Every structure is written in structure tokens, then in C-alpha cells.
Design a protein around this motif. Structure first.
Motif, short mmCIF file in Angstrom:
data_model
loop_
_atom_site.label_atom_id
_atom_site.label_comp_id
_atom_site.label_asym_id
_atom_site.label_seq_id
_atom_site.Cartn_x
_atom_site.Cartn_y
_atom_site.Cartn_z
N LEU A 176 -7.07 2.10 8.72
CA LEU A 176 -5.63 2.73 8.98
C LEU A 176 -5.15 2.00 10.09
N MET A 222 -7.63 8.87 12.42
CA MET A 222 -6.47 8.62 11.69
C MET A 222 -5.22 8.91 12.66
N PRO A 246 0.94 -1.30 0.02
CA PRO A 246 -0.20 0.12 0.02
C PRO A 246 0.80 1.32 -0.06
N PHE A 247 1.96 1.24 0.69
CA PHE A 247 2.78 2.45 0.65
C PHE A 247 4.01 2.40 0.08
N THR A 291 1.35 4.07 13.55
CA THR A 291 2.65 3.87 13.42
C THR A 291 3.23 3.64 14.72
N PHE A 332 2.77 8.52 8.08
CA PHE A 332 3.06 9.48 9.52
C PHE A 332 4.41 9.36 10.15
N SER A 333 5.28 8.11 9.70
CA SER A 333 6.52 7.90 10.16
C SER A 333 7.59 8.99 9.73
N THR A 367 -0.18 -0.19 6.75
CA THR A 367 -1.28 -0.97 6.31
C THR A 367 -2.59 -0.34 6.26
N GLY A 368 -3.13 -0.13 5.23
CA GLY A 368 -4.45 0.57 4.91
C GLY A 368 -4.73 1.50 3.74
N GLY A 369 -5.78 2.08 3.72
CA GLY A 369 -6.13 2.86 2.60
C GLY A 369 -7.63 2.61 2.38
#
Ligand code: HEM
Ligand code: HEM
Lengths: 183, 174
Positions: free
Chosen positions: B56, B135, A49-50, B59, A77-78, B41-43
Motif C-alpha cells: 500500500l 496501512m 487496482p481501485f 494518499t 482512504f481519499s 496503488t496496492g493490494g
């Protein structure tokens, strides 16, 4: 050295004029009257996904789209937050995305121009100041100015007489570019 | 009317205390005892900017949520960066799987929320506020909506009701 593919449609255009047109079309379908907006609403990272070997996005004002190819990573967000980094080998611009991981990768229904063998590599430590981040972040809203700056530098590295004001015809004569099918 | 599923782990917890705990854990894995971060992971499903789900994970820990409904994100379209549409459910738990999305450990789910925010409300829409808050692990907007829905079943119910009390009232289920 950068390598460029261009649709026969744009042979006589300068790179700068072409990029301004793609950007205008990304902003408004009516910059190319006669076009329809009916591309699948697809895009993202492949595989995601990223992270992935591609990041692809289509406008929602038109079917203008890009595909960034390389070894790409988004931090979300990291730290450093909201940074796209990694290796950027290619940027392909055109109309309508198709495909995805399940069909061999994202593709453009009409590839207008592709800038390849870019050799761009931005480390995570540069955060949002990375060249890869700036180029792709610009393109997400149809802003090709960061891309244009890099293409200009890469062309000048081949020969200082080449620039974003060169036509695709001229870049072909110089051995940098070759033609692909009509858009 | 709202419907809630809850792990029996939280039978005697109030809704507010559970939400505070999930939010704390979203913020720091050490907020719960013996946990390890090992789940980005997510979306949207299907995405890229629209879907029947948006999910979501944190982290800082494996805390995660899944929003269900008919959801839309405007990106650069006016009003920019707005999540809008119909929000039917929010599931909270630990670690995301899939992509439909699911939780490895689903702790609590709030369904039949009946929320619907039009694009015109922009980021002031309730849907946007609820999902955007989550989020970053901020469950306050969600909590306020749950409280209103509970009181619409009966004024004696609230986010300070325990899950067992809500089960007795016919709203929740272990
Ligand atoms: C891949 C899926 C993506 C998701 C889910 C995502 C998500 C988000 C979210 C939620 C925000 C707002 C954060 C906040 O202020 O609360 C944000 C901001 C941002 N995003 Fe992403 N994004 C994605 C892709 C990208 C890509 C590929 C780029 C760059 C090429 C990017 C660049 C940025 C930038 C620059 C910000 C603003 C950072 C700031 O100024 O604070 N995003 N993104
Ligand atoms: C779906 C994939 C997403 C992508 C690709 C994305 C991308 C971005 C980008 C690039 C920005 C920065 C805009 C700029 O610098 O011009 C941004 C900002 C923002 N995003 Fe998204 N985002 C995504 C999902 C979401 C979601 C789901 C939400 C809300 C639930 C959200 C909320 C926001 C907000 C509120 C901002 C503005 C933050 C600020 O300026 O304070 N994003 N996003």
C-alpha cells in the motif's frame, strides 16, 4: 429502461424470490445442495487496482458471484473515504468467476440473471450514500436488498404493474427480459 | 534470525528514528524536504483476499510499504476483517511499482521476521496489528516486533541501535 436477462432455470420465479435464493446461496453453498465450491479465488476491479469498467466478487462460502459493470471508482482512504462511485450500467449474478483484464473481462461460468441498462450514476459528492455504493457494498456480503430496491423502482418506471414480484416470464412478455442458457 | 537491508542514507540513524521519519512522511509529504506527491496503488499479490504480498501507498505522500509472506484476509468471514498468516518481511520506502510489488526507492527492509498469526487470534494477531498499523503509516507495532527480534540475537541490540551498529552485529546490510 432496464433490460433483464435470465437463465431458463428461473423463468417461473419472481425477481424477489430469485434474489433471495442467490443471497442465501452466497451465504451458504448448502442452500443449493449438490453444488461444489471450487471457483478460482479471483475478483476485484478490471483493470484495477481501485477503478475499472468492472468490479467482481465471489463468495467464499460458495461460488455465488456478482459482476458490476460501468465506470466505477473506489476512493479507499481519499475523501470521501471508502466510497464506490461512478456509473453502474449492469449487475450480473451467478456462479463462479472466470477471467479478468488479461482475458477480456470477468465473466460468470453460469450467469443466472443480469440487470442491464440500469442508468445508475452516483457522483463522488454523495459519498457512501450513493446508490451505486449501497448496491455494490450490499452485494459484497451477499445482501441483495439495495439491489432489489433499485430493480423494483426501475421496473415500475417501465410500467407500474411490473415490480420485483413479477416473474421473469412476465417481464419477458412485457418486453423487458429475455432468457439465456441453463445455469 | 532477523535480517535488515538499509540504504546508506540511513547508516547513522537508529531504527526508531528511521521508522518515525517514514511514518511522518506517510502522514504528510511536507514531513520531508523537497518531496512531491506524484505516485493509488496496492493490494494483495495475487489477491483478491490472499497473497504472498500485501502492499500500500499513502494518499498524503508517496510513502509505501510491502508486506511479504503467506497472508490472508477474512473480509466478512469470522473473525471479520482479520489479516492473518505468515509475515516474513516488511519493506519500507517511497512509491509502489508492479503488482510482484516493488518500491521505486526501497529505504529499509526487515526480513526473516518469523511472525505467524493464526486466524483464531483475529485482529489481536501480531500480523494483523503490524500490517493494519502500516496501512495508516503507524509503524509502532512493527517497531516492537523488530526490537524483540534484535534482542533475540543479542540483548545489547535494539531499535535504538544504528543501522551501522546492526551491520557490525551481523544483522544488517547496506
Ligand atoms: C478494492 C479493494 C478494497 C480495499 C483494499 C479496501 C480496503 C478497506 C479497508 C482497509 C477498510 C478499513 C478502513 C479502516 O477502518 O481502517 C475498508 C473499509 C470499508 N470499505 Fe473498502 N476496500 C476495498 C473495496 C471496497 C468496495 C468496492 C467497497 C464498496 C462497494 C468498500 C466499502 C467499504 C466500506 C463501506 C468500509 C467502512 C467505512 C466505515 O464505515 O468507516 N470497500 N476498506
Ligand atoms: C483486500 C481488500 C479489502 C477489502 C475489499 C476490504 C473491505 C472492507 C469492508 C467493506 C469493510 C467494512 C465492513 C462493513 O461495513 O460491514 C472493511 C472493514 C475493515 N477492514 Fe477491510 N478490506 C480489505 C483489506 C483490508 C486489509 C488488508 C486489512 C488489514 C490489514 C483490513 C482491515 C479492516 C478492518 C480492521 C475493518 C473494520 C474497521 C472498523 O470497523 O473499525 N482490510 N473492509
Amino acid at each position: 429502461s432496464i433490460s433483464i436477462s435470465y437463465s431458463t432455470t428461473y423463468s417461473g420465479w419472481t425477481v424477489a424470490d430469485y434474489l433471495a435464493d442467490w443471497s442465501a446461496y452466497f451465504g451458504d453453498v448448502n442452500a443449493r445442495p449438490g453444488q461444489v465450491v471450487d471457483g478460482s479465488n479471483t475478483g476485484g476491479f478490471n483493470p484495477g487496482p481501485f477503478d475499472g469498467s468492472q468490479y467482481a466478487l465471489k463468495s467464499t462460502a460458495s461460488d455465488a458471484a456478482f459482476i458490476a459493470g460501468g465506470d466505477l471508482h473506489y476512493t479507499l482512504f481519499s475523501n470521501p473515504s471508502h466510497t464506490l462511485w461512478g456509473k453502474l450500467d449492469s449487475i450480473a449474478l451467478g456462479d463462479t468467476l472466470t477471467g479478468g483484464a488479461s482475458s477480456g473481462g470477468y465473466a460468470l461460468d453460469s450467469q443466472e440473471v443480469s440487470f442491464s441498462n440500469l442508468g445508475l450514476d452516483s457522483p463522488i459528492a454523495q459519498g457512501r450514500d450513493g446508490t451505486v455504493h449501497k448496491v455494490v457494498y450490499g452485494l459484497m456480503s451477499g445482501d441483495s436488498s439495495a439491489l432489489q430496491g433499485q430493480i423494483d423502482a426501475l421496473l415500475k418506471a417501465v410500467d407500474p404493474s411490473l415490480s420485483i414480484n413479477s416473474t421473469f416470464d412476465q417481464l419477458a412478455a412485457a418486453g423487458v427480459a429475455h432468457a439465456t442458457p441453463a445455469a
